[PDB]
Amino acid sequence: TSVGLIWAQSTSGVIGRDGGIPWRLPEDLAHFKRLTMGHTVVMGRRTWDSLPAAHRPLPGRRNVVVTRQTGLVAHGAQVVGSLEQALSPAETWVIGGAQIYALALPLANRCEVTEVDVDLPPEDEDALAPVLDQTWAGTSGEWLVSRSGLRYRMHSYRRL
Ligand SMILES: NC(=O)c1ccc[n+]([C@@H]2O[C@H](COP(=O)([O-])OP(=O)(O)OC[C@H]3O[C@@H](n4cnc5c(N)ncnc54)[C@H](OP(=O)(O)O)[C@@H]3O)[C@@H](O)[C@H]2O)c1
Ligand SMILES: Nc1nc(N)c(OCCCOc2ccccc2CCC(=O)O)c(-c2ccc(C(F)(F)F)cc2)n1
């Protein structure tokens, strides 16, 4: 019933580039697994096809893919034709990408953001993070240092 968006972004707001994610941050993958394990995860079809083969479907989670197609070549998803169909019938996580974040933003009650301090000026075809309006209240964790050297931190928003 509760609908959460979860994403990682560069400070500049990039979430996706060239059909993938333009940084590596192991600590964020662990965070993403902890928050989503045992829950339904909803994603757009491009994100489904973007998963490396070892990670598709996401293990231990019910994988729901939003698409206008009849069905998919890549196995392991339950396909739906709309976000509403994905959401009904306690925690449903929308895990990307930009198109599916835009669809889910009006419905969500939580956002869990990882900010990665990697210098990625936006390029012409990048997917960008959604912008949160005045209906959201947020708290931010401290800056952390990855074993890879990148700084990162988590922001958590709840609908007012
Ligand atoms: N940094 C992060 O946290 C994060 C997370 C996830 C993904 N990403 C990145 O985000 C990028 C992909 O995002 P994206 O915005 O291009 O794609 P997306 O949101 O993953 O998927 C778009 C697809 O969803 C389907 N769709 C969209 N709106 C729909 C609607 N109203 N009804 C039914 N189906 C609908 C369509 O599938 P069909 O074409 O099959 O009809 C469409 O092509 C990649 O670079 C990925 O690596 C980043
Ligand atoms: N905070 C956060 N919220 C997300 N919605 C998210 O995306 C989830 C869809 C992609 O999931 C992948 C993609 C590739 C490899 C593995 C997975 C998930 C595997 C699993 O969970 O068992 C991410 C995030 C960021 C970077 C990477 C990276 F590894 F590509 F760098 C992965 C995920 N991070």
PDB file of N, CA and C in Angstrom, residues 58-119:
ATOM      1  N   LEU A  58      15.938  -9.400 -10.039  1.00  0.00           N
ATOM      2  CA  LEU A  58      16.569  -9.120  -8.761  1.00  0.00           C
ATOM      3  C   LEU A  58      16.202 -10.234  -7.789  1.00  0.00           C
ATOM      4  N   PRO A  59      17.160 -10.978  -7.255  1.00  0.00           N
ATOM      5  CA  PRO A  59      16.799 -12.150  -6.444  1.00  0.00           C
ATOM      6  C   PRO A  59      16.159 -11.756  -5.122  1.00  0.00           C
ATOM      7  N   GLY A  60      15.195 -12.580  -4.684  1.00  0.00           N
ATOM      8  CA  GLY A  60      14.538 -12.357  -3.404  1.00  0.00           C
ATOM      9  C   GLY A  60      13.480 -11.273  -3.403  1.00  0.00           C
ATOM     10  N   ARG A  61      13.094 -10.784  -4.571  1.00  0.00           N
ATOM     11  CA  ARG A  61      12.118  -9.728  -4.681  1.00  0.00           C
ATOM     12  C   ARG A  61      11.188 -10.102  -5.819  1.00  0.00           C
ATOM     13  N   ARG A  62       9.943  -9.648  -5.733  1.00  0.00           N
ATOM     14  CA  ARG A  62       8.991  -9.872  -6.811  1.00  0.00           C
ATOM     15  C   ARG A  62       9.199  -8.769  -7.844  1.00  0.00           C
ATOM     16  N   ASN A  63       9.624  -9.151  -9.039  1.00  0.00           N
ATOM     17  CA  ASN A  63      10.008  -8.203 -10.081  1.00  0.00           C
ATOM     18  C   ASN A  63       8.817  -7.931 -10.990  1.00  0.00           C
ATOM     19  N   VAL A  64       8.357  -6.680 -11.006  1.00  0.00           N
ATOM     20  CA  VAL A  64       7.237  -6.245 -11.847  1.00  0.00           C
ATOM     21  C   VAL A  64       7.748  -5.221 -12.840  1.00  0.00           C
ATOM     22  N   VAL A  65       7.481  -5.452 -14.141  1.00  0.00           N
ATOM     23  CA  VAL A  65       7.997  -4.590 -15.209  1.00  0.00           C
ATOM     24  C   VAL A  65       6.847  -3.905 -15.934  1.00  0.00           C
ATOM     25  N   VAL A  66       6.937  -2.580 -16.037  1.00  0.00           N
ATOM     26  CA  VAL A  66       5.915  -1.762 -16.681  1.00  0.00           C
ATOM     27  C   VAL A  66       6.298  -1.580 -18.145  1.00  0.00           C
ATOM     28  N   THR A  67       5.414  -2.012 -19.056  1.00  0.00           N
ATOM     29  CA  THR A  67       5.691  -2.003 -20.474  1.00  0.00           C
ATOM     30  C   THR A  67       4.369  -1.886 -21.227  1.00  0.00           C
ATOM     31  N   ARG A  68       4.433  -1.338 -22.433  1.00  0.00           N
ATOM     32  CA  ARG A  68       3.285  -1.382 -23.334  1.00  0.00           C
ATOM     33  C   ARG A  68       3.275  -2.614 -24.227  1.00  0.00           C
ATOM     34  N   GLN A  69       4.333  -3.412 -24.220  1.00  0.00           N
ATOM     35  CA  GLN A  69       4.404  -4.620 -25.045  1.00  0.00           C
ATOM     36  C   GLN A  69       3.594  -5.769 -24.429  1.00  0.00           C
ATOM     37  N   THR A  70       3.267  -6.762 -25.267  1.00  0.00           N
ATOM     38  CA  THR A  70       2.560  -7.941 -24.781  1.00  0.00           C
ATOM     39  C   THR A  70       3.375  -8.691 -23.731  1.00  0.00           C
ATOM     40  N   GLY A  71       4.672  -8.850 -23.969  1.00  0.00           N
ATOM     41  CA  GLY A  71       5.536  -9.568 -23.046  1.00  0.00           C
ATOM     42  C   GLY A  71       6.949  -9.361 -23.533  1.00  0.00           C
ATOM     43  N   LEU A  72       7.887  -9.975 -22.822  1.00  0.00           N
ATOM     44  CA  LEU A  72       9.302  -9.660 -22.973  1.00  0.00           C
ATOM     45  C   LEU A  72      10.110 -10.901 -23.325  1.00  0.00           C
ATOM     46  N   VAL A  73      11.253 -10.674 -23.977  1.00  0.00           N
ATOM     47  CA  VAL A  73      12.161 -11.770 -24.301  1.00  0.00           C
ATOM     48  C   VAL A  73      12.966 -12.191 -23.083  1.00  0.00           C
ATOM     49  N   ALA A  74      13.393 -11.220 -22.258  1.00  0.00           N
ATOM     50  CA  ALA A  74      14.203 -11.475 -21.072  1.00  0.00           C
ATOM     51  C   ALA A  74      13.328 -11.974 -19.920  1.00  0.00           C
ATOM     52  N   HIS A  75      13.648 -13.164 -19.406  1.00  0.00           N
ATOM     53  CA  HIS A  75      12.795 -13.892 -18.473  1.00  0.00           C
ATOM     54  C   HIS A  75      12.930 -13.405 -17.037  1.00  0.00           C
ATOM     55  N   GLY A  76      11.861 -13.610 -16.271  1.00  0.00           N
ATOM     56  CA  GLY A  76      11.901 -13.451 -14.814  1.00  0.00           C
ATOM     57  C   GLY A  76      10.975 -12.362 -14.295  1.00  0.00           C
ATOM     58  N   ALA A  77      10.284 -11.625 -15.157  1.00  0.00           N
ATOM     59  CA  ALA A  77       9.435 -10.528 -14.738  1.00  0.00           C
ATOM     60  C   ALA A  77       7.990 -10.945 -14.776  1.00  0.00           C
ATOM     61  N   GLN A  78       7.190 -10.202 -14.016  1.00  0.00           N
ATOM     62  CA  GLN A  78       5.751 -10.180 -14.203  1.00  0.00           C
ATOM     63  C   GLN A  78       5.441  -8.870 -14.901  1.00  0.00           C
ATOM     64  N   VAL A  79       4.805  -8.933 -16.089  1.00  0.00           N
ATOM     65  CA  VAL A  79       4.587  -7.708 -16.869  1.00  0.00           C
ATOM     66  C   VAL A  79       3.233  -7.105 -16.541  1.00  0.00           C
ATOM     67  N   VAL A  80       3.204  -5.778 -16.505  1.00  0.00           N
ATOM     68  CA  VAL A  80       1.978  -5.010 -16.340  1.00  0.00           C
ATOM     69  C   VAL A  80       1.985  -3.876 -17.351  1.00  0.00           C
ATOM     70  N   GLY A  81       0.795  -3.382 -17.673  1.00  0.00           N
ATOM     71  CA  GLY A  81       0.645  -2.331 -18.659  1.00  0.00           C
ATOM     72  C   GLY A  81       0.507  -0.924 -18.120  1.00  0.00           C
ATOM     73  N   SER A  82       0.569  -0.755 -16.793  1.00  0.00           N
ATOM     74  CA  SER A  82       0.431   0.563 -16.174  1.00  0.00           C
ATOM     75  C   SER A  82       0.958   0.505 -14.747  1.00  0.00           C
ATOM     76  N   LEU A  83       1.283   1.675 -14.209  1.00  0.00           N
ATOM     77  CA  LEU A  83       1.736   1.729 -12.826  1.00  0.00           C
ATOM     78  C   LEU A  83       0.635   1.290 -11.865  1.00  0.00           C
ATOM     79  N   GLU A  84      -0.610   1.682 -12.134  1.00  0.00           N
ATOM     80  CA  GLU A  84      -1.714   1.267 -11.276  1.00  0.00           C
ATOM     81  C   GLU A  84      -1.824  -0.241 -11.204  1.00  0.00           C
ATOM     82  N   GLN A  85      -1.668  -0.914 -12.345  1.00  0.00           N
ATOM     83  CA  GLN A  85      -1.704  -2.371 -12.357  1.00  0.00           C
ATOM     84  C   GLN A  85      -0.537  -2.962 -11.567  1.00  0.00           C
ATOM     85  N   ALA A  86       0.619  -2.289 -11.568  1.00  0.00           N
ATOM     86  CA  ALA A  86       1.774  -2.755 -10.796  1.00  0.00           C
ATOM     87  C   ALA A  86       1.541  -2.662  -9.299  1.00  0.00           C
ATOM     88  N   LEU A  87       0.722  -1.700  -8.866  1.00  0.00           N
ATOM     89  CA  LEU A  87       0.639  -1.348  -7.446  1.00  0.00           C
ATOM     90  C   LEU A  87      -0.450  -2.076  -6.690  1.00  0.00           C
ATOM     91  N   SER A  88      -1.426  -2.633  -7.387  1.00  0.00           N
ATOM     92  CA  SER A  88      -2.517  -3.294  -6.711  1.00  0.00           C
ATOM     93  C   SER A  88      -2.637  -4.709  -7.248  1.00  0.00           C
ATOM     94  N   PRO A  89      -2.857  -5.713  -6.380  1.00  0.00           N
ATOM     95  CA  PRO A  89      -2.929  -5.608  -4.911  1.00  0.00           C
ATOM     96  C   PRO A  89      -1.587  -5.306  -4.250  1.00  0.00           C
ATOM     97  N   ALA A  90       3.808  -5.158   2.321  1.00  0.00           N
ATOM     98  CA  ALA A  90       3.271  -3.825   2.607  1.00  0.00           C
ATOM     99  C   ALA A  90       4.080  -2.685   1.962  1.00  0.00           C
ATOM    100  N   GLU A  91       5.195  -3.008   1.328  1.00  0.00           N
ATOM    101  CA  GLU A  91       6.080  -1.979   0.802  1.00  0.00           C
ATOM    102  C   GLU A  91       6.329  -2.289  -0.654  1.00  0.00           C
ATOM    103  N   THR A  92       6.013  -1.342  -1.532  1.00  0.00           N
ATOM    104  CA  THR A  92       6.270  -1.500  -2.964  1.00  0.00           C
ATOM    105  C   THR A  92       7.287  -0.446  -3.377  1.00  0.00           C
ATOM    106  N   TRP A  93       8.401  -0.883  -3.938  1.00  0.00           N
ATOM    107  CA  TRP A  93       9.505   0.012  -4.258  1.00  0.00           C
ATOM    108  C   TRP A  93       9.571   0.208  -5.768  1.00  0.00           C
ATOM    109  N   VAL A  94       9.553   1.466  -6.184  1.00  0.00           N
ATOM    110  CA  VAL A  94       9.757   1.831  -7.578  1.00  0.00           C
ATOM    111  C   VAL A  94      11.242   2.128  -7.766  1.00  0.00           C
ATOM    112  N   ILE A  95      11.898   1.360  -8.639  1.00  0.00           N
ATOM    113  CA  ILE A  95      13.354   1.311  -8.664  1.00  0.00           C
ATOM    114  C   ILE A  95      13.938   1.856  -9.956  1.00  0.00           C
ATOM    115  N   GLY A  96      13.119   2.501 -10.780  1.00  0.00           N
ATOM    116  CA  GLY A  96      13.564   3.235 -11.952  1.00  0.00           C
ATOM    117  C   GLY A  96      12.922   2.729 -13.231  1.00  0.00           C
ATOM    118  N   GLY A  97      13.234   3.408 -14.321  1.00  0.00           N
ATOM    119  CA  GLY A  97      14.106   4.559 -14.407  1.00  0.00           C
ATOM    120  C   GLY A  97      13.333   5.875 -14.413  1.00  0.00           C
ATOM    121  N   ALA A  98      13.843   6.868 -15.166  1.00  0.00           N
ATOM    122  CA  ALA A  98      13.285   8.213 -15.111  1.00  0.00           C
ATOM    123  C   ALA A  98      11.821   8.237 -15.518  1.00  0.00           C
ATOM    124  N   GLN A  99      11.457   7.503 -16.570  1.00  0.00           N
ATOM    125  CA  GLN A  99      10.058   7.505 -16.986  1.00  0.00           C
ATOM    126  C   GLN A  99       9.144   6.933 -15.912  1.00  0.00           C
ATOM    127  N   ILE A 100       9.549   5.829 -15.291  1.00  0.00           N
ATOM    128  CA  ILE A 100       8.692   5.212 -14.287  1.00  0.00           C
ATOM    129  C   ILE A 100       8.719   6.009 -12.981  1.00  0.00           C
ATOM    130  N   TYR A 101       9.822   6.719 -12.712  1.00  0.00           N
ATOM    131  CA  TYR A 101       9.812   7.634 -11.551  1.00  0.00           C
ATOM    132  C   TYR A 101       8.785   8.740 -11.752  1.00  0.00           C
ATOM    133  N   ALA A 102       8.693   9.287 -12.964  1.00  0.00           N
ATOM    134  CA  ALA A 102       7.731  10.359 -13.220  1.00  0.00           C
ATOM    135  C   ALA A 102       6.307   9.855 -13.019  1.00  0.00           C
ATOM    136  N   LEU A 103       6.029   8.618 -13.429  1.00  0.00           N
ATOM    137  CA  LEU A 103       4.684   8.065 -13.271  1.00  0.00           C
ATOM    138  C   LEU A 103       4.349   7.844 -11.811  1.00  0.00           C
ATOM    139  N   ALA A 104       5.323   7.387 -11.024  1.00  0.00           N
ATOM    140  CA  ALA A 104       5.087   7.027  -9.632  1.00  0.00           C
ATOM    141  C   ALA A 104       5.164   8.191  -8.664  1.00  0.00           C
ATOM    142  N   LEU A 105       5.836   9.278  -9.035  1.00  0.00           N
ATOM    143  CA  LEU A 105       6.018  10.404  -8.118  1.00  0.00           C
ATOM    144  C   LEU A 105       4.716  10.919  -7.509  1.00  0.00           C
ATOM    145  N   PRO A 106       3.632  11.128  -8.269  1.00  0.00           N
ATOM    146  CA  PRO A 106       2.374  11.601  -7.643  1.00  0.00           C
ATOM    147  C   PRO A 106       1.757  10.607  -6.667  1.00  0.00           C
ATOM    148  N   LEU A 107       2.146   9.336  -6.708  1.00  0.00           N
ATOM    149  CA  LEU A 107       1.553   8.303  -5.867  1.00  0.00           C
ATOM    150  C   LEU A 107       2.385   7.961  -4.648  1.00  0.00           C
ATOM    151  N   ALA A 108       3.635   8.400  -4.594  1.00  0.00           N
ATOM    152  CA  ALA A 108       4.567   7.880  -3.608  1.00  0.00           C
ATOM    153  C   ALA A 108       4.380   8.538  -2.254  1.00  0.00           C
ATOM    154  N   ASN A 109       4.726   7.794  -1.197  1.00  0.00           N
ATOM    155  CA  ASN A 109       4.785   8.422   0.119  1.00  0.00           C
ATOM    156  C   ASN A 109       6.201   8.501   0.681  1.00  0.00           C
ATOM    157  N   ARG A 110       7.191   7.885   0.031  1.00  0.00           N
ATOM    158  CA  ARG A 110       8.576   7.929   0.470  1.00  0.00           C
ATOM    159  C   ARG A 110       9.509   7.975  -0.723  1.00  0.00           C
ATOM    160  N   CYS A 111      10.633   8.675  -0.555  1.00  0.00           N
ATOM    161  CA  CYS A 111      11.759   8.624  -1.491  1.00  0.00           C
ATOM    162  C   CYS A 111      13.037   8.356  -0.718  1.00  0.00           C
ATOM    163  N   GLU A 112      13.847   7.414  -1.207  1.00  0.00           N
ATOM    164  CA  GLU A 112      15.142   7.079  -0.613  1.00  0.00           C
ATOM    165  C   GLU A 112      16.198   7.319  -1.676  1.00  0.00           C
ATOM    166  N   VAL A 113      17.026   8.337  -1.468  1.00  0.00           N
ATOM    167  CA  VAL A 113      17.972   8.812  -2.458  1.00  0.00           C
ATOM    168  C   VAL A 113      19.377   8.557  -1.963  1.00  0.00           C
ATOM    169  N   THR A 114      20.234   8.047  -2.820  1.00  0.00           N
ATOM    170  CA  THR A 114      21.674   8.083  -2.608  1.00  0.00           C
ATOM    171  C   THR A 114      22.251   9.141  -3.517  1.00  0.00           C
ATOM    172  N   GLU A 115      22.973  10.094  -2.928  1.00  0.00           N
ATOM    173  CA  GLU A 115      23.740  11.057  -3.694  1.00  0.00           C
ATOM    174  C   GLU A 115      25.191  10.609  -3.751  1.00  0.00           C
ATOM    175  N   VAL A 116      25.739  10.539  -4.955  1.00  0.00           N
ATOM    176  CA  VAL A 116      27.120  10.156  -5.210  1.00  0.00           C
ATOM    177  C   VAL A 116      27.873  11.404  -5.657  1.00  0.00           C
ATOM    178  N   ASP A 117      28.949  11.743  -4.949  1.00  0.00           N
ATOM    179  CA  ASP A 117      29.727  12.927  -5.301  1.00  0.00           C
ATOM    180  C   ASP A 117      30.764  12.563  -6.373  1.00  0.00           C
ATOM    181  N   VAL A 118      30.241  12.362  -7.559  1.00  0.00           N
ATOM    182  CA  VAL A 118      31.013  12.107  -8.763  1.00  0.00           C
ATOM    183  C   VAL A 118      30.665  13.230  -9.711  1.00  0.00           C
ATOM    184  N   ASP A 119      31.678  13.769 -10.382  1.00  0.00           N
ATOM    185  CA  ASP A 119      31.518  14.954 -11.232  1.00  0.00           C
ATOM    186  C   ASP A 119      31.088  14.512 -12.619  1.00  0.00           C
TER     187      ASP A 119
END
